[PDB]
Amino acid sequence: STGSATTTPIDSLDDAYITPVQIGTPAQTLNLDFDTGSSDLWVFSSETTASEVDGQTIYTPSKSTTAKLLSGATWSISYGDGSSSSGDVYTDTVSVGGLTVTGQAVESAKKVSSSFTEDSTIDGLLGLAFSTLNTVSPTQQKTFFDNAKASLDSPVFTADLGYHAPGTYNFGFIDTTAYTGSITYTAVSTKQGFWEWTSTGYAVGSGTFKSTSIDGIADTGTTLLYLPATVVSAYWAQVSGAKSSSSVGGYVFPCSATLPSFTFGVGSARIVIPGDYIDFGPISTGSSSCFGGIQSSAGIGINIFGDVALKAAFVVFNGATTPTLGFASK
Secondary structure (H helix, E strand, C coil): CCEEEEEEECCCCCCCEEEEEEECCCCEEEEEEEECCCCCEEECECCCCHHHCCCCCCECHHHCCCCEEEEEEEEEEECCCCCEEEEEEEEEEEEECCEEEEEEEEEEEEEECHHHHCCCCCCEEEECCCHHHCCCECCCCCCHHHHHHHHCCCCEEEEECCCCCCEEEEECCCCCCCCCCCCEEEECECCCCCCEEEEEEEEECCCCCEEEEEEEEECCCCCCEEECHHHHHHHHCCCCCCEEECCCCEEEEECCCCCCCEEEEECCEEEEECHHHHEEEECCCCCCEEEECEEECCCCCCEEECHHHHCCCEEEEECCCCCEEEEECC
């Protein structure tokens, strides 16, 4: 089997992407944030504290003939940005782009943090990291991908995120029309439960490539590119007037600037992030100070190849017995 679904930016800055997901019978379609950096499929629901729901579409398990309470199971998750959610668990039928999993754990939120409430466009998350990170207790549950894997034509999914435009998540096949040149594959460590890999270096603009190992995660659920302070300083030093602002919470730059590209290495290959992808616009409405899309990972504890980086590539998440990651230009 295969599936193919379009993923759409939630706003004009590509802050996140939503993908329609069918849950239950008859289908209830929710728009979920596909997140390769976590492993829980959770939704706003009929059980979510009413004051914490503000415009989201909810899953109502009592209206699904295939929903079953997973008795005694609870979940609770905290994300790198400080947001969180928790609740109980149902199993139900879940379909993405024509690919159907029966018996998928659908984690129903009783509580969500303010960041989730305030984002009316995201109805929940669909985790695509390794199932070892799943938070369901006392019986850990599998991701949608893990459940689908044996049925897939090939044990892969691909992320093809757009810049200010829709893109695609495919399951079970590699669309050879969706990228240019060849796909370069690189080793993954699953030791922390992430799609963790090592970039071979970087360049700023038309500058020379610096060969240096940068360990990080491919994370579709993170907006920006978080890299070591040395790398980030080297990038922003090429933008007149750019500076790190503790009050704003990272590097800012004059909105009048033209940003240089940023290149990262994948083995001997190179992925170029155009300068415009690194512009996240005014820090507040009407400001001439703009927020940068490359930020320091110092004090995160991990480097994160988030959407800023991933949307410059066609990315293969290869879930074979020995997982790997592939990147192509597009």
